[PDB]
Backbone:
């Protein structure tokens, strides 16, 4: 039972959890923001121009987190902290 | 009151909902028509 094997399995599981959480959060948050945008445009077709400015912000604040998660997942699998 | 439809012309938002507003407004319309008729009658009487 090589220590590196256990550490790598744990790192893979941790990265899986990180990406699962990131994907759930990103998908649902983007869906909710898009729901807001779609309803706003449906009510006021010409408001779309001014609805992208907040929408994008929201998307940022969502995707940022997701992408942050991504970075750390790459840290777990490749530069596995604590691996000997 | 009967309804006659005109072919065609951002939609409106109604609080709380269109049904209650319509129910509360239609009697006001009847009163408005009665008042307009009364004013017309006064002018024609003069």
Residues:
């Amino acid at each position: 039972l090589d220590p590196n094997a256990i550490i790598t399995a744990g790192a893979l599981i941790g990265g899986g959890l990180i990406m699962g959480g990131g994907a759930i959060g990103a998908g649902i948050g983007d869906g909710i923001a898009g729901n807001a945008l779609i309803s706003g445009i449906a009510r006021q077709p010409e408001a779309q121009g001014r609805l992208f400015t907040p929408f994008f912000i929201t998307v940022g604040l969502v995707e940022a987190a997701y992408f942050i998660n991504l970075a750390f997942m790459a840290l777990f699998v490749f530069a596995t902290p604590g691996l000997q | 009151m009967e309804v006659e439809y005109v072919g065609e012309v951002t939609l409106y938002s109604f609080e709380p909902d269109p049904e209650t507003l319509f129910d509360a407004l239609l009697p006001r319309y009847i009163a408005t028509r009665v008042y307009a008729a009364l004013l017309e009658a006064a002018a024609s009487e003069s």
User: Anything to note?
Assistant: The first helix of chain A runs from residue 3 to 43.
